[PDB]
Scaffold this active site. Structure first.
Site, PDB file in Angstrom:
ATOM      1  N   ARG A 252      48.206  12.502  50.833  1.00 44.59           N
ATOM      2  CA  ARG A 252      48.399  12.192  49.425  1.00 44.59           C
ATOM      3  C   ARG A 252      48.121  10.716  49.137  1.00 44.59           C
ATOM      4  NH1 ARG A 252      54.333  14.661  48.785  1.00 44.59           N
ATOM      5  NH2 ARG A 252      54.295  13.708  50.878  1.00 44.59           N
ATOM      6  N   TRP A 261      58.373   4.040  42.409  1.00 41.75           N
ATOM      7  CA  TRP A 261      59.626   4.223  43.152  1.00 41.75           C
ATOM      8  C   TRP A 261      60.310   2.884  43.439  1.00 41.75           C
ATOM      9  CZ3 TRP A 261      60.258   8.622  47.294  1.00 41.75           C
ATOM     10  CH2 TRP A 261      60.227   9.850  46.621  1.00 41.75           C
ATOM     11  N   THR A 389      65.157  13.675  56.784  1.00 41.24           N
ATOM     12  CA  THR A 389      63.756  13.851  56.395  1.00 41.24           C
ATOM     13  C   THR A 389      63.515  13.631  54.895  1.00 41.24           C
ATOM     14  OG1 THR A 389      63.856  16.255  55.993  1.00 41.24           O
ATOM     15  CG2 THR A 389      63.361  15.556  58.258  1.00 41.24           C
ATOM     16  N   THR A 390      64.567  13.325  54.127  1.00 42.19           N
ATOM     17  CA  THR A 390      64.387  12.862  52.738  1.00 42.19           C
ATOM     18  C   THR A 390      63.745  11.485  52.737  1.00 42.19           C
ATOM     19  OG1 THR A 390      66.582  11.823  52.650  1.00 42.19           O
ATOM     20  CG2 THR A 390      66.412  14.107  51.868  1.00 42.19           C
ATOM     21  N   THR A 391      63.878  10.819  53.887  1.00 45.77           N
ATOM     22  CA  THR A 391      63.532   9.416  54.157  1.00 45.77           C
ATOM     23  C   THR A 391      64.529   8.449  53.521  1.00 45.77           C
ATOM     24  OG1 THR A 391      62.057   9.000  52.251  1.00 45.77           O
ATOM     25  CG2 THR A 391      61.042   9.989  54.230  1.00 45.77           C
ATOM     26  N   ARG A 429      67.959  15.651  48.779  1.00 43.41           N
ATOM     27  CA  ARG A 429      67.716  16.867  49.567  1.00 43.41           C
ATOM     28  C   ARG A 429      67.811  18.138  48.721  1.00 43.41           C
ATOM     29  NH1 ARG A 429      64.372  18.388  51.518  1.00 43.41           N
ATOM     30  NH2 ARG A 429      64.388  16.811  53.180  1.00 43.41           N
ATOM     31  N   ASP A 432      65.172  18.333  45.733  1.00 39.31           N
ATOM     32  CA  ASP A 432      63.834  18.594  46.263  1.00 39.31           C
ATOM     33  C   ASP A 432      63.708  20.044  46.733  1.00 39.31           C
ATOM     34  OD1 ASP A 432      61.127  17.459  47.579  1.00 39.31           O
ATOM     35  OD2 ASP A 432      62.153  18.672  49.085  1.00 39.31           O
ATOM     36  N   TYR A 508      62.124  14.630  39.639  1.00 40.71           N
ATOM     37  CA  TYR A 508      62.160  16.082  39.716  1.00 40.71           C
ATOM     38  C   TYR A 508      62.747  16.688  38.455  1.00 40.71           C
ATOM     39  CZ  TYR A 508      61.291  15.505  44.751  1.00 40.71           C
ATOM     40  OH  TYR A 508      60.754  15.165  45.971  1.00 40.71           O
ATOM     41  N   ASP A 513      58.020  19.016  41.240  1.00 44.06           N
ATOM     42  CA  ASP A 513      57.702  17.974  42.222  1.00 44.06           C
ATOM     43  C   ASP A 513      56.797  16.903  41.592  1.00 44.06           C
ATOM     44  OD1 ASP A 513      57.108  16.403  44.464  1.00 44.06           O
ATOM     45  OD2 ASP A 513      56.517  18.093  45.729  1.00 44.06           O
ATOM     46  N   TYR A 515      56.203  13.733  42.360  1.00 42.66           N
ATOM     47  CA  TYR A 515      55.473  12.829  43.242  1.00 42.66           C
ATOM     48  C   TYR A 515      54.163  13.476  43.718  1.00 42.66           C
ATOM     49  CZ  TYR A 515      54.347  10.034  47.395  1.00 42.66           C
ATOM     50  OH  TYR A 515      53.707   9.278  48.350  1.00 42.66           O
TER      51      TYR A 515
HETATM   52 MG   LIG Z   1      61.301  20.549  49.837  1.00 49.08          MG
END
Ligand SMILES: [Mg+2]
Ligand SMILES: [Mg+2]
EC number: 4.2.3.61
Length: 536
Positions: A252, A261, A389-391, A429, A432, A508, A513, A515
């Protein structure tokens, strides 16, 4: 190796941000005038013998106009006086505003200020249904509650239904302000975004507007925008000189969105270095995400994960060529941060962000293993992996790097996953997951959040999405509690975490989504903040 076909949209911006030359003539003029207006505004704040209601509306207006970061000492002193004097003798609009402003600034004012507006049963008196300004301020206040504020449990429903009822017949710009509030409340909005709307759509059109405040707000917004454009240009050139757009076509291309952001995390001039560091990290981790999600093989991802743990340029040769590109870029970036922080003797703090990145990548790899094996974990196990993993633990840690006053004790606190950070991560989390559920379900992702939830509890998609909604609401109450004094670290280090949660809500919005598909949500925000000046 046949890789999956590219499905992402190209950057919709091209090169329109790559070169920005500030007009020093105009900038210096703006700043010279702002200094004068800043002092007039200060004197409005320090004016003696103001009524409670007038004082609160002044502070509120200055905050919405986006110029309160000039007056943090003055505003704090005033709210602290109000907190300590205990004024329980006002109407609904002053009481609700008093509650919101104090809570937002960490003053734990009792929610009992609202009991006089409720019957014996704790439900708001419906006789208040014709008080539009009261309802609006109650509405905005309802989004700042904690777990100790169940007296307000009815406030959102009550204010919402009667504002909707009244809206079509309100004069302008009150009607537009109410309509906007129902779509996006103030407390959960990105500050620059809400400021831009308020200045241009509301305050500019108020019959009663203060002309000094309006001009001050317009000049300040446009002057800071010039800085933001210089930062974005500098970041656009850095990204172009990496050329991932062509050497890594699977990923991306979203550096503008990444800048939005970082702008959401903090917009003020003193965070200029912090913003530029942050956006580089967001861009880079987004490349790693797409490598795991939509290109790399199981074997390749393993080597990549292990190279990241060892963090050593000696390790590149274990990697396929295309992974060498991202891996060296990552190691170089952190060497850049280290040198950039050398002058202030803060190089050593870079290792905190590095350890959070290693964590993100380990959990990316786990998510990949799950996907290939077709594993659907229980919610508890799912979250133990998918929160990182959301960072968001990583971005929060990163947000501190460029903040000059961040100390090792601040990083030490963050490293323990305090509750306010955990809540921000949880919000990212579950929102998303609710939004990307259908898409990931069509791509074979059996280990998606909602799916884990359905299987674990034996409930429908609807029931599971509602459960995730509840987790988000609980987390917002925890964020709000985590702002209350005494704070475990300075408020300056809490606000980025709050702002990360806000970015989720905004990105969101209406369950999309934003982004991945910037055209719907993020494009008008980017144009309003970074393309178009406010016309004076
Ligand atoms: Mg997801
Ligand atoms: Mg991913």
């Amino acid at each position: 190796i046949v890789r999956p076909v590219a499905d992402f949209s190209p950057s919709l911006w091209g090169d329109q941000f790559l070169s920005f030359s500030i007009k020093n003539q105009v900038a210096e003029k703006y700043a010279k005038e702002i200094e004068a207006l800043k002092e007039q505004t200060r004197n409005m704040l320090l004016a003696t013998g103001m009524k409670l209601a007038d004082t609160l509306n002044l502070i509120d207006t200055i905050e919405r106009l986006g110029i309160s970061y000039h007056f943090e000492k003055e505003i704090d002193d005033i709210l602290d006086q109000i907190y300590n004097q205990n004024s329980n003798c006002n109407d609904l609009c002053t009481s609700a505003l008093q509650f919101r402003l104090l809570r937002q600034h960490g003053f734990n004012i009792s929610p009992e200020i609202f009991s006089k507006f409720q019957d014996e049963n704790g439900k708001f008196k419906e006789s208040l249904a014709s008080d539009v300004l009261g309802l609006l301020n109650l509405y905005e206040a309802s989004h700042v509650r904690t777990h100790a504020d169940d007296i307000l449990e009815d406030a959102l429903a009550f204010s919402t239904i009667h504002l909707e009822s009244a809206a079509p017949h309100l004069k302008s710009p009150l009607r537009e302000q109410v309509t906007h509030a129902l779509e996006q409340c103030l407390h959960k909005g990105v500050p620059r975004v809400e400021t831009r709307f308020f200045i241009s759509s509301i305050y500019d059109k108020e019959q009663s507007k203060n002309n000094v405040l309006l001009r001050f707000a317009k000049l300040d917004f446009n002057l800071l925008q010039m800085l933001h454009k210089q930062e974005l240009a500098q970041v656009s050139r850095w990204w172009k000189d990496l050329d991932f757009v062509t050497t890594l076509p699977y990923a991306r291309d979203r550096v503008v969105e990444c800048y939005f952001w970082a702008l959401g995390v903090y917009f003020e001039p003193q965070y200029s270095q912090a913003r530029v560091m942050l956006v580089k990290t967001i861009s880079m981790i987004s490349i790693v995400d797409d490598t795991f999600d939509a290109y790399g093989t199981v074997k390749e991802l393993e080597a990549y994960t292990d190279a990241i743990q060892r963090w050593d340029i000696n390790e590149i040769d274990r990697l396929p060529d295309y992974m060498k590109i991202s891996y060296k870029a990552i190691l170089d970036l952190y060497k850049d941060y280290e040198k950039e922080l050398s002058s202030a003797g803060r190089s050593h703090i870079v290792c905190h962000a590095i350890e959070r990145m290693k964590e993100v990548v380990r959990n990316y790899n786990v998510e990949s293993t799950w996907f290939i094996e077709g594993y659907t974990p229980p919610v508890s196990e799912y979250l133990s992996n998918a929160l990182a993993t959301t960072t968001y633990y990583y971005l929060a840690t990163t947000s501190y790097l460029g903040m000059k006053s961040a100390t090792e004790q601040d990083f030490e606190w963050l490293s323990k996953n305090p509750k306010i950070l955990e809540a921000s991560v949880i919000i990212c989390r579950v929102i998303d997951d609710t939004a990307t559920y259908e898409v990931e379900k069509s791509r074979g992702q059996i280990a998606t959040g909602i799916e884990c939830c359905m299987r674990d509890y034996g409930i429908s998609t609807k029931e599971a999405m509602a459960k995730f909604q509840n987790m988000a609401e609980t987390a917002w109450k925890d964020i709000n509690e985590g702002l209350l004094r005494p704070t475990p670290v300075s408020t300056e280090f809490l606000t980025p975490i709050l702002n990360l949660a806000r970015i989720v809500e905004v990105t969101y919005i209406h369950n999309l989504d934003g982004y991945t598909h910037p055209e719907k949500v993020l494009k008008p925000h980017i144009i309003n903040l970074l393309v178009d000046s406010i016309k004076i």
